[PDB]
């Protein structure tokens, strides 16, 4: 019986843009998508624990 | 000559803290980083 799976986390800014600063400036226009994804992944990790 | 385009040393950060109602000190965790390199 499987019990837990891999705990993973995403860095939204580095994934979407990498290391371009003005691209992150453009991301600032998209609101709290990254926060939502981070919260979901953190919930998944604590759920696995 | 070949130049490894290593991404500028990148790594995740995480702050361990008790409630501000209790104290103010914090601890910092750099996961995936050997801290002879910080």
């Amino acid at each position: 019986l499987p019990v837990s799976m891999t705990k993973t986390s995403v860095d939204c800014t580095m994934y979407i843009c990498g290391d371009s600063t003005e691209c992150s400036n453009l991301l600032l226009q998209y609101g709290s998508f990254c926060t939502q994804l981070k919260r979901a992944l953190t919930g998944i990790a604590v759920e696995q624990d | 000559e070949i130049l490894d385009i290593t991404p500028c040393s990148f790594g995740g950060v995480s702050v361990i803290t008790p409630g501000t109602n209790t104290s103010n000190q914090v601890a910092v965790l750099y996961q995936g980083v050997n801290c002879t390199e910080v």
Partner: peptide
């Protein structure tokens, strides 16, 4: 033995020794 870019694989809280 029989089982083998902004993305990080967080280690589990409980090590294999603790579960064992």
């Amino acid at each position: 033995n029989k089982v083998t870019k902004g993305l990080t694989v967080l280690p589990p809280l409980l090590t294999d020794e603790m579960i064992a």
